UniProtKB/Swiss-Prot annotation, chain A:
Gene: rplP
Lineage of origin: Bacteria, Pseudomonadati, Pseudomonadota, Gammaproteobacteria, Enterobacterales
PTM section of the record: Is hydroxylated on Arg-81 by RoxA. The modification is nearly suppressed when E.coli is grown in anoxia.
CDD domains registered for this protein in UniProt: Ribosomal_L16_L10e
Name this polypeptide is given: Large ribosomal subunit protein uL16
InterPro entries reported in the protein's UniProt record: Ribosomal_uL16 (IPR047873), Ribosomal_uL16_bact-type (IPR000114), Ribosomal_uL16_CS (IPR020798), Ribosomal_uL16_dom (IPR016180), Ribosomal_uL16_sf (IPR036920)
Curated annotation (Swiss-Prot), chain B:
Xref: PROSITE patterns: RIBOSOMAL_L11
Protein name: Large ribosomal subunit protein uL11
Residues carrying N6,N6,N6-trimethyllysine: 3, 39
Alphabetical GO biological process terms: cytoplasmic translation; ribosomal large subunit assembly; stringent response; translation; translational termination
Subunit record text: Part of the ribosomal stalk of the 50S ribosomal subunit. Interacts with L10 and the large rRNA to form the base of the stalk. L10 forms an elongated spine to which 2 L12 dimers bind in a sequential fashion forming a pentameric L10(L12)2(L12)2 complex.
Positions carrying N,N,N-trimethylalanine: 1
UniProtKB/Swiss-Prot annotation, chain D:
Function, as annotated: Forms part of the ribosomal stalk, playing a central role in the interaction of the ribosome with GTP-bound translation factors. Protein L10 is also a translational repressor protein. It controls the translation of the rplJL-rpoBC operon by binding to its mRNA.
More details: Ribosomal protein L8 appears to be an aggregate of ribosomal proteins L7/L12 and L10.
Gene (name only): rplJ
Residue numbers of N6-acetyllysine PTMs: 37, 105
Protein name: Large ribosomal subunit protein uL10
Keyword RNA-binding: yes
Disulfide bonds: none
UniProtKB/Swiss-Prot annotation, chain E:
Similarity annotation: Belongs to the bacterial ribosomal protein bL36 family.
Protein name, UniProt field: Large ribosomal subunit protein bL36A
Described purpose of this protein according to its UniProt entry: One of the last ribosomal proteins to be assembled in the 50S subunit, it contacts a number of helices in the 23S rRNA, acting as molecular glue. The simultaneous presence of uL16 and bL36 probably triggers ObgE's GTPase activity and eventual dissociation from the mature 50S ribosomal subunit.
Native species: Escherichia coli (strain K12)
Disulfide bonds: none
SUPFAM superfamilies assigned to the protein according to its UniProt record, in alphabetical order: Ribosomal protein L36
A single Gene Ontology CC term: cytoplasm
Record-linked InterPro entries: Ribosomal_bL36 (IPR000473), Ribosomal_bL36_sp (IPR035977)
One Gene Ontology biological process: translation
KW RNA-binding (keyword) present: yes
Length: 136, 141, 94, 131, 38, 106
RNA sequence: AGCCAGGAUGUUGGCUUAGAAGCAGCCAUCAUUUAAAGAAAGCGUAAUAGCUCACUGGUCGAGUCGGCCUGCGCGGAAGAU
C-alpha cells in the first residue's frame, strides 16, 4: 500500500476526473500497461496488481510504477447522519484518465511480459492494454 | 534387432561390486537376480581399469539371463583424473573452474569412437569438447 | 519505398480536423528553412504501417505534394491517447 | 516451411552433386528406424565423409524440378516416397548392392531397389561392380 | 459440471462449441475440463 | 532434540500390484529400500516410523487387493522428525525433593 | 486440416553423491549423424521407462492461419396478487 509521506492538508476535495492523462509514452522500460479506461485506483489495487505481475516475471528485470496514489478519500462511518463534518480519510486513490501508463517493464521477454501484464491487468478495475516503447 | 523391452543404462562405478545403496532395486526391478550384477558385471571390468562408471546394455529376457554388450564411459566422469579437478559445473560462465586444451581432449576422443557415431573424427571432436563447455570449462584451442 | 502522396490542406482549425480525423486521414505540416510553413494533409492508413520501422523516425521521407517532392524528417509526432492511431506529425524539411 | 531462397538452394546444391555424381539407388523406409540411420549413413563415414545426401524429398515439383537439367528418366521414379543417394568416389561403387542387403537386414522395405541410371536399366540387381 | 461465465481453454484438446446458441467447451480427453456457460 | 524409532518393515505384494505400492511410498513416511522379486510374488525392504507404521497395514489390505502381506520389528533409535517437537507429560512425580526443581526454573 | 512414419549413443553428466536423469530448483542451454529433433512446451515416475507436440518427409492437392481496427449481436442476466 503506497501512500504520501506527510502532506500539506489531510482531507481534500472530491473533484472531477475530466481530461486525458499526460503519461502517454513509455519512458523507462521496454513495455508498458496503458489505461484505456478512466477512474481512480486505490493504493491496494496498485499493490495487488504489483505483486500479481512481479510473480510472473519471477523477480527478474525491473518494473516501474508510473502512478502514485496522492489523493485522500474520506468516508462517513456506517450508521452516521449527514453533516457534522467531512469524514475521516481511508485510502489513497490515484485518478487515471485514459492513456495513462501504469506499469512499465524491462529485462524480460516480450510474450512473457504479455503474460505478466495480463495477470496484473486482471487486478485493475479499469480496462488497460499492452503497449511498447517507440523510437519517438 | 528387437526394439525396447526392459534394457536400461544405469549403474555407478564398475569397481563397486554388487551395488545396493546406489542402484539397488532398479537393477533388481526385473526378474534378474541381484547376484548377476557382480559375478558377471566384473567379468569385463577386470579387462580394463576398475572404478570407472561404464554403462552397459541390460536386455532382460524370460530365459533367466540376458545378453549384454559393454559400451563407453561418459565424458563427464572422464573429466576428473584427466582434468585434475574432481569438480565440474555449477558455476559455468560466471567463473573459470578449469581448462585443458584441444591437443589433449581430441587425443582421447577416438578411444570413445567405438561407441560414437561420426562420419569423421573431426566431427566427433567438438561434439565431445562441446560437452566440457557445459561444465564451464574453456578449451584451449 | 518512403513516399507518401498528400493533398494540400484547405481548412485549418480544430473543427475541420475532427471531420478529417474520422475519415482515416490525419492532418500534418511541413516546415523549416527560409520557406514559409505549408500544411500537408495525408492519409492515415498508409503512415500507420510505416512507423513500425526504426528507419521511419530517422531516414528522410520523400513526401510528394502537388507533383513537387519535399524531403522531410519526423522530428515530432503526436500519439493518440489510447486508440492505436496517429493524430499529427511535424515533418521538418531536410 | 522456408521460402524459395532456401528451397531452390536445396535443389541447386543437389544438381552440383549430379554433375560429378554417377551411381545411385532408391530407398523408401515407410517404417524406418534411427538404428537404421546408423547403418547407411555410418557407411558414408566408412567411405569418406558427409558429402552423401539421402535427401528424402521426392516431391514432383521439388526434387523432380532439377530432373530436366540432369537425367530426364529419373522423373518416372517420382511417384511415392523415394530417396536418391548420389556417389562421387569410385564410379559404380559397391554402395548400390548394400541397399538390397540392408533390406533383408531389418529394413521392411527400400523401394524394391529399382535403381537409377548407369546402364539406363531397370530393377536389376548387379554384383558386377569394379571391385 | 462447472458453470463459469469465463470459458477459456484448459487443455489443448478443448474445442469451443455453440450448441443451441449457448457457448460450451467440449473435451474428448478429461471430463473435468468440460464446463457450461459462456 | 526429539527423535522417533524407524524400524524396517518388509512386505510382500504381487508384482502386478507392485507398481501401485510405489504410490503408497509417497504417503508413507518411510524411505525406499532394496527389494527383490520372487517369481510371481514380490517383496521389498522398507523402513518407516512406528508412529505411522500402524497405518501401513491398512495400505496393503487395499492396494494389495487381499494379496498384501508384511512384517517388521522395532530397531534403530535414531529418527527425528517435525514439527513443534511436542513431548508427552509428565515427568516426574512422587519422588523426594521434587518441588525444589521448580525453584531452579527461576 | 487429417493420415501409417521418424522424433537418436554416451545426458546413471557434474549438483547438497539419499535421488532427480529431456521435464523441483540451480546454470550451461553442447555439438554431432542428418529428410528432421528443443540436449526440451505438456503428460506420466521415488528417480527411469513410457506417451505427445515442436519440427521435418510422403500420401494428398487447393488457398489458409494468426493479430489489429471497428459495426451489429450472444453469454454472464434469479424475486416474491
Amino acid at each position: 500500500m503506497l501512500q504520501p509521506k506527510r502532506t500539506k492538508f489531510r482531507k481534500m476535495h472530491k473533484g472531477r476526473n475530466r481530461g486525458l492523462a499526460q503519461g502517454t509514452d513509455v519512458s523507462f522500460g521496454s513495455f508498458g500497461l496503458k489505461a484505456v479506461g478512466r477512474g481512480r485506483l486505490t493504493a491496494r489495487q496498485i499493490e495487488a496488481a504489483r505483486r500479481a505481475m512481479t510473480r510472473a516475471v519471477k523477480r527478474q528485470g525491473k518494473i516501474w510504477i508510473r502512478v502514485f496514489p496522492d489523493k485522500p478519500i474520506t468516508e462517513k462511518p456506517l450508521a452516521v447522519r449527514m453533516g457534522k463534518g467531512k469524514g475521516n480519510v481511508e485510502y489513497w486513490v490515484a485518478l487515471i484518465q485514459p492513456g495513462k501508463v501504469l506499469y512499465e517493464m524491462d529485462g524480460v521477454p516480450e510474450e512473457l511480459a504479455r503474460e505478466a501484464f495480463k495477470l496484473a491487468a486482471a487486478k485493475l478495475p479499469i480496462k488497460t492494454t499492452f503497449v511498447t516503447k517507440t523510437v519517438m | 534387432a528387437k526394439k525396447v523391452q526392459a534394457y536400461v543404462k544405469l549403474q555407478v562405478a564398475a569397481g563397486m561390486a554388487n551395488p545396493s545403496p546406489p542402484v539397488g532395486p532398479a537393477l533388481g526391478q526385473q526378474g534378474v537376480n541381484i547376484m548377476e550384477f557382480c559375478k558377471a558385471f566384473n567379468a569385463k571390468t577386470d579387462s580394463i581399469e576398475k572404478g570407472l562408471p561404464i554403462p552397459v546394455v541390460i536386455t532382460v529376457y524370460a530365459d533367466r539371463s540376458f545378453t549384454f554388450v559393454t559400451k563407453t564411459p561418459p565424458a563427464a566422469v572422464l573429466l576428473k583424473k584427466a582434468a585434475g579437478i574432481k569438480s565440474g559445473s555449477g558455476k559455468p560462465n560466471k567463473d573459470k573452474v578449469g581448462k585443458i586444451s584441444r591437443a589433449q581432449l581430441q587425443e582421447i576422443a577416438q578411444t570413445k569412437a567405438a561407441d560414437m557415431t561420426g562420419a569423421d573424427i573431426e566431427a566427433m571432436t567438438r561434439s565431445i569438447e562441446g560437452t566440457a563447455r557445459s561444465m564451464g570449462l574453456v578449451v584451449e584451442d | 519505398m518512403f513516399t507518401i502522396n498528400a493533398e494540400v490542406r484547405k481548412e485549418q482549425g480544430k473543427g475541420a480536423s475532427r471531420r478529417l480525423r474520422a475519415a482515416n486521414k490525419f492532418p500534418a505540416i511541413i516546415y523549416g528553412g527560409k520557406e514559409a510553413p505549408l500544411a500537408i494533409e495525408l492519409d492515415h492508413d498508409k503512415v500507420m504501417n510505416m512507423q513500425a520501422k526504426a528507419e521511419f523516425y530517422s531516414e528522410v521521407l520523400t513526401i510528394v505534394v502537388d507533383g513537387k517532392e519535399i524531403k522531410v524528417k519526423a522530428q515530432d509526432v503526436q500519439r493518440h491517447p489510447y486508440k492505436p492511431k496517429l493524430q499529427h506529425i511535424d515533418f521538418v524539411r531536410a | 516451411m522456408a521460402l524459395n531462397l532456401q528451397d531452390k538452394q536445396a535443389i541447386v546444391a543437389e544438381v552440383s552433386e549430379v554433375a560429378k555424381g554417377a551411381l545411385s539407388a532408391v530407398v523408401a523406409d515407410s517404417r524406418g528406424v534411427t538404428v537404421d540411420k546408423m547403418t547407411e549413413l555410418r557407411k558414408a563415414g566408412r567411405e569418406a565423409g558427409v558429402y552423401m545426401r539421402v535427401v528424402r524429398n521426392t516431391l514432383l515439383r521439388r526434387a523432380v524440378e532439377g530432373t530436366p537439367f540432369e537425367c530426364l528418366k529419373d522423373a518416372f521414379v517420382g511417384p511415392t516416397l523415394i530417396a536418391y543417394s548420389m556417389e562421387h568416389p569410385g564410379a559404380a561403387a559397391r554402395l548400390f548392392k548394400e541397399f538390397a542387403k540392408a533390406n533383408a537386414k531389418f529394413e521392411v522395405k527400400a523401394a524394391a531397389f529399382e535403381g537409377e541410371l548407369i546402364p539406363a536399366s531397370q530393377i536389376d540387381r548387379l554384383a558386377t561392380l569394379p571391385t | 459440471m462447472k458453470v463459469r461465465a469465463s470459458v477459456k481453454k484448459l487443455c489443448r484438446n478443448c474445442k469451443i462449441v455453440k450448441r443451441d446458441g449457448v457457448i460450451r467447451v467440449i473435451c474428448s480427453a478429461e471430463p473435468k475440463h468440460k464446463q457450461r456457460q459462456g | 532434540e526429539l527423535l522417533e524409532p524407524y524400524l524396517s518393515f518388509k512386505i510382500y505384494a504381487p508384482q502386478e500390484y507392485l507398481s501401485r505400492a510405489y504410490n503408497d511410498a509417497p504417503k508413507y513416511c518411510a524411505n525406499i529400500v532394496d527389494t527383490q522379486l520372487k517369481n510371481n510374488e514380490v517383496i521389498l525392504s522398507g523402513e518407516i516410523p512406528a508412529r505411522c507404521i500402524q497405518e501401513y497395514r491398512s495400505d496393503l489390505t487395499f492396494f494389495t487387493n487381499g494379496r498384501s502381506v508384511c512384517l517388521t520389528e522395532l530397531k534403530g533409535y535414531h529418527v527425528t522428525t517435525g514439527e513443534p517437537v511436542c513431548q508427552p507429560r509428565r515427568p516426574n512425580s512422587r519422588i523426594d525433593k521434587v518441588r525444589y526443581m521448580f525453584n531452579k526454573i527461576t
